[PDB]
């Protein structure tokens, strides 16, 4: 069965770590890759769930909401809470609410880097980054139709077609699209999605490959994305009861939509056995909008001390009345990116070289036209007896609401060089990069204009030792930088923050046995983090520092043609080593322990031939609900099951029917809280039937 050897053999190749084709063992950093075969098996609903059984990442911190693919890697999120995802070696640079998403059914691969890597990609988050590989045209025909149906009125249909147009394979293509409709977990919310992905590959000769990659997506409704207070979730309400799992605190007429257009290409050319040129470019237009009413903690939460509405309440009702605000947003993002690389392979005695040098630049501009409601901008919500009604998003009086109209421009140009020198069984990775990062923000209401031009240099070095049995010990050191976007007291944009990581580990990748096992220890630390000013000024200050260190181990292997086992364990110790206020505490939403195990069996011989069965468990240890560590969030364990049946029997090979069940024991838990007034219920049990037919 396709996914057996895929998760353990194919999953051995990668490029997100070095930009050149390099096997996992020769990469001096922690890198995980999930194949499409695996994704086909699990049917993840997003890219997040596709990383479930990999170490060092929290894929479900935002609970049931699926609006964004936000990932917290090694206890770190990106600047401005924005995503940190790349599509085909190029970053889907977003801004404010404008963040693009790619359905997993359009992906071929998903590789995830852990730790710093600005060495190859410019400004990045300390924790790491995700890189999704689009499906490319197969030179072997593919004609597939798929039908989905399940819990919450989930209805989906999709197709994936690929074939050759010429007779020799000079022109091939791939067209894959889907249409999905479903109700959100929260009452009154729904999600609709429509995507089509046209790809065309032109191969002039055996040394040239030009592949056109386009993607279009329209989402009338993106679903729920609100805030619920801990009182009614983590903690029982004053009447001992807890808000229901599907509770919704937003207006009956809440709306949230997203539209995405992308055009670009990937080009390869090999001159000799010594030189190879490579270029990647994409142009993207993103549009997002929303009319949202969201919770902002109960009336007794110290966060609403200035709410006239809360105040005009008997201080007993104060603990079961939720305050609320709203936001009206509308953004338009334009993004241009090109990365050109020259790859040189040569020798020097007994030393084989693989030199990489490239120029990488990107230009984006986001046009925000929003309107936010402050305190008392929307009628309280009685948690004991909630009443969902419409909200007038237009009637906007300056008494409780003001505009927010910004035009953000970002820019980054970088030059980088890297060598992969190898002597016998020793491998040394050495590389550096220099970045020119300019940014400017124009506030249209105030007429002001803030800008800053950063210059940063980063590098990475590491050693890999290739024992002949598969054991490949290694160690490395890499840096990262992330410019700031917030303004200081002096009316300037703060200085960039930095990431420095040391890591030692081992990778077992035997050529003869189909297994992959990993273990690694690290000390990542983020410097120049923004912290509270040691003064009542509502402004912030630099010089902060957070430090994270831990152990991650991952295991993948087919104990037989019928059994496969995948799992991981993650111990992460993150902490504020120097912050004017939360010093000593551990960042919120970061658990110390994380474990996951999945296994599946398939009957080849017998009456149940072609039948597959799988189960898996992802354990999430406890975590702090706020940076003050004033309350915790209970650990939880979720179990998933699977039932698949090859249809070769009935007459159709390649095709199959499946039944997936997530959160089998329908456990009710809160995924996390980033504060007392910001918690999220986890996802209730879901059952989905999937028919995938191949002609
Ligand atoms: C085949 C599944 C996709 C069809 C979409 C039908 C319309 C969904 S929405 O327009 C109304 C939901 O009640
Ligand atoms: C092949 C599946 C196509 C089904 C989608 C039909 C249109 C739904 S949406 O485009 C308009 C809803 O009012
Ligand atoms: C059959 C699935 C639909 C494919 C996507 C078609 C384009 C949607 S968006 O590009 C324009 C919306 O008006
Ligand atoms: C400018 C600071 C941003 C404040 C956040 C306001 C609420 C947005 S989110 O909490 C709900 C979106 O529907
Ligand atoms: C050779 C034995 C045939 C058993 C197939 C029974 C029906 C399963 S499939 O045909 C429909 C699933 O919903
Ligand atoms: C779009 C509506 C069609 C839904 C078909 C879902 C699969 C049917 S079979 O695979 C399982 C039957 O229980
Ligand atoms: C959704 C329509 C699928 C088109 C495939 C039609 C049959 C082609 S192949 O199945 C046999 C060729 O001889």
UniProtKB/Swiss-Prot annotation:
The UniProt entry, under PROSITE patterns, shows: TONB_DEPENDENT_REC_1, TONB_DEPENDENT_REC_2, TONB_DEPENDENT_REC_3
Per the UniProt entry, the disulfide pairs are: 299-310, 673-679
Give TM segment ranges. 141-149, 155-163, 171-179, 194-203, 208-216, 261-269, 275-283, 336-344, 353-361, 413-421, 426-434, 457-465, 471-479, 500-508, 514-522, 550-558, 562-570, 594-602, 610-618, 638-646, 654-662, 686-694
Topological relation to the membrane, as annotated: Multi-pass membrane protein
Documented activity regulation: Binding of ferrichrome or colicin M enhances the interaction between FhuA and TonB. TonB activates FhuA through interaction with the beta-barrel.
One Pfam family of this protein, by short name? TonB_dep_Rec_b-barrel
Annotated ranges, domain TBDR plug: 23-135
GO aspect biological process, one term = siderophore transmembrane transport
Which domain of life, per UniProt?
Bacteria
Q: Where is this motif: TonB C-terminal box?
A: 678-695
All copies of the TBDR beta-barrel domain together span 140-695
The residues that hold ferrichrome are 62, 81, 96-97, 225-227, 294-296, 372, 683
Q: Where is this site: Interaction with phage T5 RBP-pb5?
A: 514
Q: How does it assemble?
A: Monomer. Interacts with TonB. Interacts with Escherichia phage T5 receptor-binding protein pb5 (RBP-pb5); this interaction is necessary for the entry of the viral genome into the host cell.
Protein name as it appears in the record? Ferrichrome outer membrane transporter/phage receptor
- Which gene underlies this protein? fhuA
């Amino acid at each position: 069965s396709a996914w057996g050897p895929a998760a353990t053999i194919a999953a051995r190749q990668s490029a997100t770590g070095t930009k050149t084709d390099t096997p996992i063992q020769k990469v001096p950093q922690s890198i995980s890759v999930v194949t499409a075969e695996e994704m086909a098996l699990h049917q993840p609903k997003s890219v997040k769930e596709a990383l479930s059984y990999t170490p060092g990442v929290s894929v479900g911190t935002r609970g049931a909401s699926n609006t964004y693919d936000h990932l917290i890697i090694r206890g770190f999120a990106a600047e401005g809470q924005s995503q940190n995802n790349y599509l085909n070696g190029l970053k889907l640079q977003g801004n404010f609410y404008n963040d693009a998403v790619i359905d997993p059914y359009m992906l071929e691969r998903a590789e995830i880097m852990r730790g710093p890597v600005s060495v190859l990609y410019g400004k990045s988050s300390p924790g790491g980054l995700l890189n999704m590989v689009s499906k490319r045209p197969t030179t072997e025909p593919l004609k597939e139709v798929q039908f989905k149906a399940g819990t919450d009125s989930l209805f989906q249909t999709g197709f994936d077609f690929s074939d050759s147009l010429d007779d020799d394979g000079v022109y091939s293509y791939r067209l894959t699209g889907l249409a999905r409709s479903a109700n959100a977990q929260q009452k009154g919310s729904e999600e609709q999605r429509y995507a089509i992905a046209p790809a065309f590959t032109w191969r002039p000769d055996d040394k040239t490959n030009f592949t056109f990659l386009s993607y279009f997506q329209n989402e009338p409704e993106t679903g729920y994305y609100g805030w619920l207070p801990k009182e009614g979730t983590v903690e029982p309400l004053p009447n001992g009861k807890r808000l229901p799992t599907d509770f919704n605190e937003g207006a009956k007429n809440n709306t949230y939509s997203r539209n995405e257009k992308m055009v670009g290409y990937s080009f390869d050319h090999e001159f000799n056995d010594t030189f190879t040129v490579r270029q990647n470019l994409r142009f993207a237009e993103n549009k997002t909008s929303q009319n949202s009413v969201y919770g902002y903690g109960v009336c007794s939460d110290p966060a609403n001390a200035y709410s006239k509405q809360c105040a005009a309440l008997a201080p007993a009702d104060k603990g079961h009345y939720l305050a609320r605000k709203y936001v009206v947003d509308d953004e338009k993002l334009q993004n241009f990116s090109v990365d050109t690389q020259l790859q040189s392979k040569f020798a020097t005695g007994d030393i084989d070289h693989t030199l990489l040098t490239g120029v990488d630049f990107m230009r984006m501009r986001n046009d925000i036209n929003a309107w936010f409601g402050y305190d008392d901008s929307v009628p309280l919500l009685n948690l004991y007896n909630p009443v969902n009604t419409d909200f007038d998003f237009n009637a906007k009086d300056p008494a409780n609401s003001g505009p927010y109209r910004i035009l953000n421009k970002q820019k980054q140009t970088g030059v980088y060089v890297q060598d992969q020198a190898q002597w016998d069984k020793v491998l040394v990775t050495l590389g550096g990069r220099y970045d020119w990062a300019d940014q400017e923000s124009l506030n249209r209401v105030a007429g002001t204009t803030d800008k800053r031009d950063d210059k940063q240099f980063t590098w990475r070095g590491g050693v890999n030792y290739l024992f002949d049995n598969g054991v490949t010990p290694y160690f490395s050191y890499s840096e990262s930088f992330e410019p700031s976007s917030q303004v200081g007291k002096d009316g300037n944009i703060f200085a960039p923050s930095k990431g420095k990581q040391y890591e030692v580990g081992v990778k077992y990748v035997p050529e003869d046995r189909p297994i992959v096992v990993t273990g690694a220890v690290y000390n990542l630390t983020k410097t120049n983090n923004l912290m509270a000013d040691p003064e009542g000024s509502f402004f912030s200050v630099e010089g902060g520092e957070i430090r994270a260190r831990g152990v991650e181990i991952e295991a993948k292997r087919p104990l037989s043609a019928s059994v496969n086992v995948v799992g991981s364990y993650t111990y992460t110790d993150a902490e504020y080593t120097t912050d004017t206020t939360y010093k000593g505490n551990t960042p919120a939403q970061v658990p110390k322990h994380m474990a996951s195990l999945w296994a599946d069996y398939t009957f080849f011989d017998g009456p149940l031939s072609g039948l597959t069965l799988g189960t898996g468990g992802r354990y999430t240890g406890s975590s702090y609900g706020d940076p003050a560590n004033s309350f915790k969030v209970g650990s939880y364990t979720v179990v998933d099951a699977l039932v698949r049946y090859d249809l070769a029997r009935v007459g159709m090979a390649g095709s199959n029917v499946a039944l997936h069940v997530n959160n089998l024991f329908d456990r009710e838990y809160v995924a996390s809280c980033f504060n007392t007034y910001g918690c999220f219920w986890g996802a209730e049990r879901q059952v989905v039937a999937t028919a995938t037919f191949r002609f």
